[PDB]
Amino acid sequence: KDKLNPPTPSIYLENKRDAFFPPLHQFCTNPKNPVTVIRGLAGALKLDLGLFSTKTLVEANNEHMVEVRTQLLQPADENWDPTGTKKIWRCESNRSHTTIAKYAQYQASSFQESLREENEKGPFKTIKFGTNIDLSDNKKWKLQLHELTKLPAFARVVSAGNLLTHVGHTILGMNTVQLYMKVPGSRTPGHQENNNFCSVNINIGPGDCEWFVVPEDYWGVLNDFCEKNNLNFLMSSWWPNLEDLYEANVPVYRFIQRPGDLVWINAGTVHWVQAVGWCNNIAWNVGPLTACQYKLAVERYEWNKLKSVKSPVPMVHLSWNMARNIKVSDPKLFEMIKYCLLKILKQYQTLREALVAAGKEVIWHGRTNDEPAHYCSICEVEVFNLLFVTNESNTQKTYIVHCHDCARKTSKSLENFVVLEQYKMEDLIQVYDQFTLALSLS
Numbered sequence: 001k002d003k004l005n006p007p008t009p010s011i012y013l014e015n016k017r018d019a020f021f022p023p024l025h026q027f028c029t030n031p032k033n034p035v036t037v038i039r040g041l042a043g044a045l046k047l048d049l050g051l052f053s054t055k056t057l058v059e060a061n062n063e064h065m066v067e068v069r070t071q072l073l074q075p076a077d078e079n080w081d082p083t084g085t086k087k088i089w090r091c092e093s094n095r096s097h098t099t100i101a102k103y104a105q106y107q108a109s110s111f112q113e114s115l116r117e118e119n120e121k122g123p124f125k126t127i128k129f130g131t132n133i134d135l136s137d138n139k140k141w142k143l144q145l146h147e148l149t150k151l152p153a154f155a156r157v158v159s160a161g162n163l164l165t166h167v168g169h170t171i172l173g174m175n176t177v178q179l180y181m182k183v184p185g186s187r188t189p190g191h192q193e194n195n196n197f198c199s200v201n202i203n204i205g206p207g208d209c210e211w212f213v214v215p216e217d218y219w220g221v222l223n224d225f226c227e228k229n230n231l232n233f234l235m236s237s238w239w240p241n242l243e244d245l246y247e248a249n250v251p252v253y254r255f256i257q258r259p260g261d262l263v264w265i266n267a268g269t270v271h272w273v274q275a276v277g278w279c280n281n282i283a284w285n286v287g288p289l290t291a292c293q294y295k296l297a298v299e300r301y302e303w304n305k306l307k308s309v310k311s312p313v314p315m316v317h318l319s320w321n322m323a324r325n326i327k328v329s330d331p332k333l334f335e336m337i338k339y340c341l342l343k344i345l346k347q348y349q350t351l352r353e354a355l356v357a358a359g360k361e362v363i364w365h366g367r368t369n370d371e372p373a374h375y376c377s378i379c380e381v382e383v384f385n386l387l388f389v390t391n392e393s394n395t396q397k398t399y400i401v402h403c404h405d406c407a408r409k410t411s412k413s414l415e416n417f418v419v420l421e422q423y424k425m426e427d428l429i430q431v432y433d434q435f436t437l438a439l440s441l442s
């Protein structure tokens with residue numbers, strides 16, 4: 001069925017008017033569009049993609065760290081076992097580290113070597129992919145990061161309407177820029193984004209990338225394929241067999257991203273990518289203030305706890321920041337936030353009361369302003385308000401945080417721990433009570 005190979009939602013920009021046009025924002029965030037390809041974006045803004053050329057990067061910071069993935073160079077859209085016998089989901093991707101200057105040398109000699117071959121089942125060649133390059137430092141990358149402020153507000157790394165701007169601290173690769181340096185065949189295996197946030201990706205060129213996209217609501221089916229093939233959905237590297245997806249009636253969006261094209265991956269959308277030519281890419285995340293985005297973020301946050309995986313985004317901390325600082329006028333979104341806050345409040349109340357009733361002292365610790373969120377030093381769960389710290393760490397003021405469960409596993413009556421309280425109970429109740437539905441006529 002041609003319904004299993006649908007057309008990709010696309011917008012063709014000509015000029016700055018088209019880029020700043022408000023229905024473009026609304027199209028991208030529509031939950032019915034699992035992906036949007038904004039074609040011609042860089043040319044429309046006169047973005048200087050040369051600021052991200054390999055030549056410019058080498059001159060800017062030649063020793064900057066690059067994470068290298070070594071992979072097999074595979075035919076078209078397929079993934080074969082390394083003996084060339086059968087197509088499988090597991091794809092090998094070994095890790096090491098190099099510098100921008102060393103990868104640059106490989107990328108250039110890779111192309112020259114391919115030129116010479118042009119002019120003059122396996123087995124498969126091996127290639128190297130430069131990934132997760134950290135462009136967070138404003139001093140090191142001044143002109144690069146400035147160029148990205150030319151984007152329309154909804155797609156920027158920082159903006160008033162971006163939930164990740166409201167977290168209150170740096171989450172590397174989410175509210176900072178990541179760079180990728182590629183050769184043909186360089187593959188990003190199947191995944192969803194961290195805590196299901198949207199992603200923005202611009203191809204620097206000169207070569208193309210090819211993208212595969214599956215809607216969020218089919219993720220359970222892909223999870224099943226993984227487990228059936230002895231792979232973890234969240235932790236392992238997998239490359240879907242398209243004939244398996246087709247036979248299971250999963251629709252796959254498939255398209256080419258050319259230099260200057262911006263790809264918007266909507267919340268929770270499952271995707272994997274390969275370079276067709278030689279190119280660089282930049283990417284980051286964004287969180288639109290919609291019900292769909294809040295729901296899918298919370299859902300992945302909770303799924304991560306069950307799977308013993310850490311959440312990079314502290315949704316409890318973020319939720320209180322939303323109630324404090326953002327006017328919310330969508331009734332469905334408002335009710336979601338209100339529900340989540342009321343649950344948090346009740347959990348906190350129940351724990352605090354059990355502690356007091358057990359004759360355990362709750363020690364006022366207060367909070368420094370603009371202080372970030374905290375996680376459990378053992379299990380890496382987010383920990384909110386009530387912190388559990390050993391007697392010794394308390395005295396030494398190294399205040400190492402534990403969650404309640406981990407402290408109790410180690411010290412059965414918490415006799416080895418102090419309980420620190422950051423937020424006055426009446427504060428939290430106030431913030432909650434103050435938070436009401438705003439009127440918008442839009």
Ligand SMILES: N#Cc1ccccc1O
Binds near residue numbers: 065097098
């Ligand atoms: N090699 C290497 C490396 C790994 C993590 C962070 C910085 C590095 O230079």
Ligand SMILES: N#Cc1ccccc1O
Binds near residue numbers: 391392410416417
């Ligand atoms: N419980 C516990 C514990 C473990 C290492 C050091 C100090 C402690 O209170």
Ligand SMILES: [Mn+2]
Binds near residue numbers: 191193199
């Ligand atoms: Mn991605």
Ligand SMILES: [Zn+2]
Binds near residue numbers: 378379405
């Ligand atoms: Zn813990």
